[PDB]
Amino acid sequence: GADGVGNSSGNWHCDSTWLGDRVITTSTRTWALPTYNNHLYKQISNGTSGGSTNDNTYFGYSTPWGYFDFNRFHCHFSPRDWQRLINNNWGFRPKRLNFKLFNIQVKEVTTNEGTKTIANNLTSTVQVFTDSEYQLPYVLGSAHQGCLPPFPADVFMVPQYGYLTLNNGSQALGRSSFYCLEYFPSQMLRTGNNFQFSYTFEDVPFHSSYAHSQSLDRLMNPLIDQYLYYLVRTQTTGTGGTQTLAFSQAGPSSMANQARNWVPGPCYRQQRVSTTTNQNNNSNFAWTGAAKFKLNGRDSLMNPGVAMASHKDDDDRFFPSSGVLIFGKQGAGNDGVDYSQVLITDEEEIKATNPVATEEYGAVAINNQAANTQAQTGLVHNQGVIPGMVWQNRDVYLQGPIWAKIPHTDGNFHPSPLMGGFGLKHPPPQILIKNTPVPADPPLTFNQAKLNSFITQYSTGQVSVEIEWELQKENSKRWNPEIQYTSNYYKSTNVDFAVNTEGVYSEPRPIGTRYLTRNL
Amino acid sequence: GADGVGNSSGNWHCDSTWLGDRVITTSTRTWALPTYNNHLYKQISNGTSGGSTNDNTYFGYSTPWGYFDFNRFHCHFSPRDWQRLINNNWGFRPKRLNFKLFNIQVKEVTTNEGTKTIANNLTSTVQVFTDSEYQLPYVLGSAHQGCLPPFPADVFMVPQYGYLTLNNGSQALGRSSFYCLEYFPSQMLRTGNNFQFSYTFEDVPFHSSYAHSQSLDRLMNPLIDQYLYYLVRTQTTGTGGTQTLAFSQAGPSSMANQARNWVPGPCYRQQRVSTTTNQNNNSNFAWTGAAKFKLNGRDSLMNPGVAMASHKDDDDRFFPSSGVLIFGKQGAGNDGVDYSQVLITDEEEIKATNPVATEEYGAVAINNQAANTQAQTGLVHNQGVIPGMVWQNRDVYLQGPIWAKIPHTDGNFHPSPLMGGFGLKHPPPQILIKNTPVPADPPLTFNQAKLNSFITQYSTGQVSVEIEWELQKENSKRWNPEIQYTSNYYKSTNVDFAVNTEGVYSEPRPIGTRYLTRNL
Numbered sequence A, B: 001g002a003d004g005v006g007n008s009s010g011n012w013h014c015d016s017t018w019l020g021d022r023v024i025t026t027s028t029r030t031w032a033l034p035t036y037n038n039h040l041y042k043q044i045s046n047g048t049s050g051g052s053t054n055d056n057t058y059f060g061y062s063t064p065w066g067y068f069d070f071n072r073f074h075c076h077f078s079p080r081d082w083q084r085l086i087n088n089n090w091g092f093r094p095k096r097l098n099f100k101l102f103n104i105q106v107k108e109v110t111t112n113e114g115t116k117t118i119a120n121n122l123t124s125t126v127q128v129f130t131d132s133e134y135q136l137p138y139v140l141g142s143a144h145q146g147c148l149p150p151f152p153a154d155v156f157m158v159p160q161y162g163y164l165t166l167n168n169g170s171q172a173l174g175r176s177s178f179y180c181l182e183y184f185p186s187q188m189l190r191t192g193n194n195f196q197f198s199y200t201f202e203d204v205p206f207h208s209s210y211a212h213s214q215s216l217d218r219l220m221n222p223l224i225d226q227y228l229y230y231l232v233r234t235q236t237t238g239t240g241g242t243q244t245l246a247f248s249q250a251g252p253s254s255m256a257n258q259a260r261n262w263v264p265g266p267c268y269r270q271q272r273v274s275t276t277t278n279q280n281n282n283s284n285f286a287w288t289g290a291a292k293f294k295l296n297g298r299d300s301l302m303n304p305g306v307a308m309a310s311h312k313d314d315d316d317r318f319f320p321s322s323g324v325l326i327f328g329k330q331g332a333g334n335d336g337v338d339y340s341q342v343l344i345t346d347e348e349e350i351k352a353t354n355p356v357a358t359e360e361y362g363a364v365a366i367n368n369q370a371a372n373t374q375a376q377t378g379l380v381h382n383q384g385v386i387p388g389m390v391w392q393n394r395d396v397y398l399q400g401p402i403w404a405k406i407p408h409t410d411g412n413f414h415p416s417p418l419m420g421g422f423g424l425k426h427p428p429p430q431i432l433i434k435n436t437p438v439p440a441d442p443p444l445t446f447n448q449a450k451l452n453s454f455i456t457q458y459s460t461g462q463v464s465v466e467i468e469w470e471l472q473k474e475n476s477k478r479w480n481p482e483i484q485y486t487s488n489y490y491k492s493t494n495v496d497f498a499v500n501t502e503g504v505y506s507e508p509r510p511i512g513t514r515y516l517t518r519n520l
């Protein structure tokens, strides 16, 4: 038969294939969908009143719908695969994908007298649809939990969909928009029924898997001397102290002086903090210290900020308070976890072209030099883009994000997601799922009221995401061995990126993308 | 319909057909699959610490998967069939096979208040796949229990899959590899869904079902005398005792002296032990006595060793402590069972070309003979292969193993499984099965955690293995009746290879392969 209950409505594909440039990832996981909001759209707001501050106010709605998110690299990549990709390519980018939902099973749970039994409702349905026109608030790219699990074996719960609208305090404005998912043409399923579609990534720039092997400043030959001169002295050396103009040709020895065609990238000052406890000043400056941007009278934290080097050499302990991504160690607590639990990423690789996060961009003269007045200079903590700058985008990690929807705005600049990734105008459409409400027996005499009693049930099934990535091979003529991600030989009680003695896959550290080195 | 619940998704084939050389075996058994490891991959290690010795240390993983093993002769052969094959062929070998899984039924068991009920989950699925590329640690050929039952009627449990990786003590090394079965493209089934495939055995040498009827030493005509001489005496006979060189032509009477073109096979000394209790020395030399090979600082027992004759004639009671296969009598206990329970196989058939297990290979001179110094000789307990050797491989039994995967190594010698069988580089692929986890109702509010609650269920179904064997008929011109496996006429209370009064099929003794005799 075509579609029956005693028939697999799809298969399990979890494979990675490398041919030439194209690497194909395929993942399958087993999901479970709870009933959300008792089949109800609820208005949710957080007020100014009460303990909560004004910066955490919001207005929105929580829907009875769940959504499928695969926006995390680890979903499509095995740790071993991530290794192959990082260690041999100068870049890569998504090309197309394929989604599938199958072997859907709906169960109805009954409880009597502390006795609980779960069996099948076959006639029951499950609704699915894609926001192919992008008419629904984009949830994804907010780094929200609920993406497919990293380990294929694990079975996961489907995230609940909800959105935010313009708000003043705990109130909404005239502008704020209320969306109803049901007002969307969605496809329905019964077990033996399957859903699926395909999408093709708009053209996007290859991510850089290469870390520079020349600093922006050191772009010139040591042996030669520039044909240009610079002002070397305003005053005669020694006792005389009489103003004079002396000019010198910037040479190899005087490298700093010599003129350059390109200058470092932009910077927003980030407060510095040291892993060692003692060094830090004894105040709770987590918030007061941190850089932030104020929008509509509300100050939001600048996380994770513009792309900047985490630390200057040998300052490894240092990190921006808010200027890097942080990943919890497995089993880590959501609130107030200790330092040991967290994995603080490090973006030092990009130090060569990008400004250090914790230091000034540089200095600019504050006044005209005078016969009486002395020259002055001021520091640059906040530096915007100017002609001649070059820079590197923030890195993605095996457990990082992949893409993000570029806001539909009149304009924007270098729209590469600040958390790292590919910026798409038309990203993979949001996939929405929901269990169709099955009413409990209605009262015998007609009632104008809307039914408030339903059979309790949840659904389960497999999901498949297959993505085709385009690689960009290395062309380096570097004579010496390059740096590469490896797993240390030395013995240990547990294996890296494996299950422990209890059956708990764990990702020991974040894994960057740039190991291979390319010239500037 | 094509695939429905009320439809047999396969039939029962249990037949043997003989045409010409080709004998075709077909078996079908009914299996049951329990849930394994609560749907969890678990890290398993045995430590140096505690009672366990260092030689029993290991590191590995236990998977939620089960595997189908047919690697035992009795599965495909009826005892009567084994008889026909052994009693009329000089050899045979596997040619191709066909596997099938069908009539899959998944049951979900419920327990309330000490009340247990088992019914059907139809929408539930079962995953299956073959390691057609050999990317998974090879379990088979380790003589592990869990192969299809010998008796067709019996219903069996499916073995759990698990593997081992490089370990130091209870720790893993950097090299050690962790495999995830789910990362394998596997096919899913619902009842009315069936799986199946075919494989063809790489070319392999016919097993020898023939026992030699000439000793390697006695390969020459009695009547004739060799045209070659040997050194018969170093000293004059009688009183004189003065050195002289005397040479004689090796004749029929002096058979031992005469030169030969071929010499016996290799040997590793095996400690001798007698079935009679009194003869044996009163010490627990089971381990201390036994020969062993030390790998990576760990001593493993040499079981079952190289192929060697169990005993010289009339030494029938004797056997190598570790140098023969042992099969438990039906109902025999796993640990510390008495001698009566066990069936100790006997490889005396091969004594003619192979060295006796318990005796030295022979002797070699230890020094140069001297006018003053006397000649000396030393025994050879360990003897490696040298030009001119010929030997017989170890026999397979009706309840023995069939093939084994030749380790993917740079080199090897005469790669015939030491436990007996056919050595294949690409053996029948491991067949992996697993019940797909069906989650218990999830909590209403999204949780980042991985689901830990599942409906309890197991599966059942029929399995079919069909193998085509190629025979090699006897060509003997032997005038007298040959020895053959028979069942003794004399009355008994139970029939050989039948069920007893309780319904317990039992294999009374091991059944060899070599009865027919061929010349050397």
Ligand SMILES: Nc1ncnc2c1ncn2[C@H]1C[C@H](O)[C@@H](COP(=O)(O)O)O1
Binding pocket: A204, A205, A413, A414, A415, A416, A417, A421, A422, A423, A424
């Ligand atoms: N990841 C990503 N997504 C979307 N747009 C991006 C991305 N990275 C850079 N850009 C911007 C930068 C330029 O404005 C343009 C490509 O020009 P070019 O001269 O090639 O830099 O796209």
Ligand SMILES: Nc1ncnc2c1ncn2[C@H]1C[C@H](O)[C@@H](COP(=O)(O)O)O1
Binding pocket: B204, B205, B413, B414, B415, B416, B417, B421, B422, B423, B424
């Ligand atoms: N059972 C089995 N499996 C695999 N390889 C085997 C087996 N028996 C012997 N051999 C080896 C011995 C030789 O190296 C080769 C066949 O050569 P020949 O001159 O025919 O002995 O194969």
Ligand SMILES: [Cl-]
Binding pocket: A328, A329, A330, A331, A332
């Ligand atoms: Cl976490």
Ligand SMILES: [Cl-]
Binding pocket: B328, B329, B330, B331, B332
């Ligand atoms: Cl047994």
Ligand code: NA
Binding pocket: A037, A042, A044, A062
């Ligand atoms: Na709510």
Ligand code: NA
Binding pocket: B037, B042, B044, B062
């Ligand atoms: Na276990």
